Paper text:
The PH domain-containing protein Slm1 from budding yeast Saccharomyces cerevisiae is required for actin cytoskeleton polarization and cell growth. The PH domain-containing protein Slm1 from S. cerevisiae is a component of the target of rapamycin complex 2 (TORC2) signaling pathway. The core of each monomer consists of seven antiparallel β-strands with a C-terminal amphipathic α-helix connected via a long and flexible loop.
In the non-canonical binding site there are four residues that are consistently involved in ligand binding: Arg478, Tyr485, Lys542 and Lys562. In addition, all structures in complex with ligands show regions of additional density between the bottom of the β1-β2 loop and the N-terminus of Slm1-PH.
Residue numbers in the entry:
A (entry chain B), C (entry chain B): 467 to 532, 536 to 550, 553 to 554, 557 to 583
B (entry chain A), D (entry chain A): 466 to 530, 538 to 549, 555 to 582
The structure:
């Protein structure tokens, strides 16, 4: 819109060992977080992460094991000071995770 | 924001504070972003991101013939009207026209 | 994609007094014509009309009368030399026509 | 094409004719367009419009340390590989990177 990908992801809290869910939109420039999927009424990102200073490092394998989504996670790494502290995201499936990861890898590659 | 369509300094008016503040604006197909500085390598988090899908540009200054370099950006969710001021009528018209074609829907 | 509008339009031949149908995509910059609606395999416009040198002039009223689509036409005018010779387009309905026209009017306005 | 992301002169190689030809390229979110000239007011019909949705940028020159300012644009519908040459490695890398982020899907 122009968007590369959009959908729900859960993001892990380092300290709280829990996840929070948001609706994410990946553009050529940013990973934006929104509270909802209503693109007509929910238009202010709660957060926008600039891809220029991120990298995606690891991701689950289809066979990765242990509770939910053990095969559906990826790590987004910061290269500049949101502090490089890593964000762990969890998608709904391996296939969905790989779609996010494959796009992020090219957008953040060198 | 390297799918940038246009960028440059603009002043934006605050209604309540009765003052202008200059920011560095970047227009993409999705947003008009405000950043504090023009350093696209170190200043990466927008101060503000205005979704183009619910903005329209309505009026602008008539050229002199006081600043004639202003335009209004209107919001729907709702009745909001930001006033911007560019360096010249010419620069204002570039912003206005570029915003217009990204906000026709 | 980024697109403002897309859909089927019929375009009139001045000399032949007949219409030909295409799939059109309106962007902030162009009115593109494609042979089909398959955005995955049909990717070369047969024609791209630059909006910078077009204007939309008249359009049908909901009550415009006489054979098909008498309430669904609009005229796209050229301001520079595709020669200003006018193109007449016909949409599927008044409502659809107005969507095309309203967008074109702002994109080509002064 | 005023939602232009990038524009500039590039040389494109013809495989059959064994020659380069310089054109003025305009990158939008949808296409890489070739125009004969840089006159955006009088030269309005693209010579060629390459749909980004089915292109990828694959390889590029390594910096010198012969031109080191080339990159390959690959097509799917299918196996097509256009070679482009920019004025410098630096200019080539700007094209390459801007194309890359519009062609990740």
């Amino acid at each position: 819109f122009t968007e590369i990908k959009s959908g729900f992801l859960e993001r892990r809290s380092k300290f709280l060992k829990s996840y929070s869910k948001g609706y994410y939109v990946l553009t050529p420039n940013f990973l934006h977080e929104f509270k909802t999927a209503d693109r007509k009424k929910d238009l202010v990102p709660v957060m926008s992460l600039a891809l220029s200073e991120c990298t995606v490092t690891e991701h689950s394998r289809k066979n990765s094991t242990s509770s939910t989504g053990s095969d559906a996670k990826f790590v987004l790494h910061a290269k500049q000071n949101i502090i490089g502290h890593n964000y762990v995201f969890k998608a709904d499936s391996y296939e969905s995770m790989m779609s996010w990861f494959d796009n992020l890898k090219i957008l953040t590659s060198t």
